[PDB]
Design a protein around this ligand. Structure first.
Ligand SMILES: *[C@@H](C(N)=O)[C@H](O)C(=O)CC/C=C/C/C=C/C
Ligand SMILES: *[C@H](C(N)=O)[C@H](O)C(=O)CC/C=C\C/C=C/C
Lengths: 412, 412
């Protein structure tokens, strides 16, 4: 006896822009948001570029006094959230506040703050750790601070499922509404992992592209010369709403959230199975959840992180799940332009999938100069493709073999 | 139309013991697991004691190679998880593995690992960061490594909701089963924040008891001389199972999980509202979820962290929710003995609630020498109280005003 769930608001900070429309313009233009990092000295690091959010002004949202306490991941998460609530036109009242909840997640949350409080502790000692370190750094405080600012009293929580965080946060918030725990959820992800620990940590695991000479050409999903993902920062937030609650208040409806899949590879801590069996199971769970034939999918927003193993695993999974229809649909990686927003990747890509439906256009896979062996699908190489899209699918795969799939369709 | 969920296995590392029965013996004996910390120099810190796990042997569960890369919070979570799966008697097969998932969470996850990789980064630079830093430190890797070790292909995720993490992880895993997403879930929490950042972080926010001269007397919920919570380490894990799946395989059933409630205070980043209005809403949501009259609750395992504001707010909430029945039920804080396991607090306290039902006994609130103004309920001061218990309730409250309540009842 589950209710239908629609998207009535979207908000975003990306390497391509400080909101959704500016980010989406970047996407359709094939623009890279990847550039040498400038906020820290990366001379000793094998990767010196990433997707920074450019020109972020927190004072558009919060007092400088408030924001001083908050790690950038919380600033970015609040900014995207505030945008999405505004965009929904939803009015929070005594009558609906217990029915509006929040699920904004992160991969690691306040790493910059943790790194800085660690410097203070080691160099100076524990009397120099900020009283605001914990409430300013832990992952659930986007959900926390958003609920305090807006008076949201519904379910209040955060997921942390590595690069799957954004996808799961949206899927499980949809489940909250579908099963009557809430009428409205603000859900998505924020990440700011562009510090020594983040760039050094992924560096030490050799996960990152080291194409320092051409940073805009580094993220090249399914291209034979790909050499790992590009670390990027940002936040995506959607207002999810029960269909009748939306219809009743005359809400502008972007799309319907019809399918959510989760699954575990149970294969390896960091590498995906070569045949993408976990991704394949996850996509099939989401399609069954949606009551859809695989042939109804027109657009896939791939995980497509630009790793050797991950990209081909995703091709195999799509070929397994869709058979001959795999050559009819369009699949692209917007990480070709945005790089990899980690715990935020699934939230910004949920928004790009919803906009692909609104505008009937497949975003491009830029830098796809030489598709690898077996990468023979319509990957929307170089340039945006206007086309029919009634159903869009977004994938995220994470450390621990954790998988998420979101299925959106045009709302009647 | 939603399915019933029972507890068929439990696992724990606590300051009181390296498994459930040893921990539960400590609880019923009124024993403190709180002592001066010995694994680090705390001379410059205002708090020098906490609840350590004593004598943990990871090699009972993992190979040296398996354990070396993993933060203690993952070691502790895997140990509790493995105990719970063994304790369930569940056999994982090709036939049931896609129906068995994992939701083990943490407040902050791999803080000790983060501290250690930061020392290397500051002293020597990023070439000295472990390749295993990320997969070895991030919160979702208890769920990840457990699924890889046991071949679990069901829903795979992690919550991070501060001190509410364990309660939410259990509640939402129960929802997964109730709503047919899985037949079995391993759920709970693990925390190891007994490092500089943890003791310094909470110290800087003045949240911790500084009664260094009597560490076993420091955790004193509802006592007039209380001066903040006691930082403690450990893990709790429950095997949650659909009732018919349990009956069908002849599983031993500890208790039924009947109610789960969440709510946001939307009041303050760290302080609860004086009248505990958020807690009150959360407890009422759980009882409504359970289809129970407040008068059916016999035992409450309080949040009861031993903070001035938190303890009295919880009394107010119980008085609001239960009225005259507030004087009939028994409410205790096992943190009087265990200290606060943070993201694990909710998991170990879910287990103590289930055991209060099994043994028909209310655990004591030790150190309750002088109950504060308004603390005039049956708080089970000093000594365990044998009594009728058909329904037990467990609360957790977190930073961000995030609330969780779990309602368990004796299984027919
Ligand atoms: C994502 C991927 N490579 O596809 C993977 O889940 C991952 O490594 C992210 C883990 C967490 C993110 C934040 C980390 C900071 C150090
Ligand atoms: C605890 C509480 N009872 O309010 C609080 O919610 C909390 O634990 C915040 C941080 C969680 C744990 C990890 C942090 C360690 C430094």
């Amino acid at each position: 006896s589950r209710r239908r769930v629609v998207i009535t608001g979207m908000g975003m900070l990306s390497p391509l822009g400080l909101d959704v429309p500016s980010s989406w313009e970047g996407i359709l233009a094939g623009r890279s948001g990847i550039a040498p990092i400038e906020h820290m000295d990366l001379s000793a690091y094998s990767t010196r570029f990433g997707g920074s959010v450019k020109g972020f002004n927190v004072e558009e949202y919060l007092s400088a006094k408030e924001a001083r306490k908050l790690d950038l991941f919380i600033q970015y998460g609040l900014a995207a959230s505030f945008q999405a609530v505004r965009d929904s036109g939803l009015e929070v009242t005594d009558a609906n506040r217990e029915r509006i909840g929040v699920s904004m997640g992160s991969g690691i949350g306040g790493l910059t703050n943790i790194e800085n409080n660690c410097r203070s502790l080691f160099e100076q000692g524990p009397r120099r750790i900020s009283p605001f370190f914990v409430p300013g750094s832990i992952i659930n405080m986007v959900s926390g601070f958003l609920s305090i600012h807006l008076g949201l009293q519904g379910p209040n929580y955060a997921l942390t499922t590595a690069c799957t965080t954004g996808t799961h946060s949206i899927g499980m918030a949809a489940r909250n509404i579908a099963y009557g725990e809430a009428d409205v959820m603000v859900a998505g992800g924020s990440e700011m992992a562009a510090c020594g620990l983040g760039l050094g940590g992924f560096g030490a695991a050799r996960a990152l592209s080291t194409r320092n000479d051409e940073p805009t050409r580094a993220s090249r999903p399914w291209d034979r010369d790909r050499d790992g993902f590009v670390l990027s920062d940002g936040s995506g937030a959607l207002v999810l709403e029960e269909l009748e609650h939306a219809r009743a208040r005359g809400a502008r409806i972007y799309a319907e959230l019809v399918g959510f899949g989760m699954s575990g590879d149970a294969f390896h801590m960091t590498a995906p199975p070569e045949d993408g069996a976990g991704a394949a199971r996850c996509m099939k769970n989401a399609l069954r959840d949606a009551g859809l034939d695989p042939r109804q999918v027109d657009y896939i927003n791939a995980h497509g992180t630009s790793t050797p193993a991950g990209d081909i695993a995703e091709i195999a999974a799509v070929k397994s799940v869709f058979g001959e229809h795999a050559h009819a649909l369009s699949m692209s990686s917007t990480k070709s332009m945005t790089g990899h927003l980690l715990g935020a990747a699934g939230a910004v890509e949920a928004i790009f999938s919803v906009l692909a439906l609104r505008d009937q256009v497949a975003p491009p896979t830029i830098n796809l100069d030489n598709p690898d062996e077996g990468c023979d699908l319509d990957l929307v190489a170089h340039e945006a493709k206007p086309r029919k899209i009634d159903v869009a699918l977004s994938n995220s795969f994470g450390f621990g073999g954790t998988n998420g799939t979101l299925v959106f369709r045009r709302f009647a």
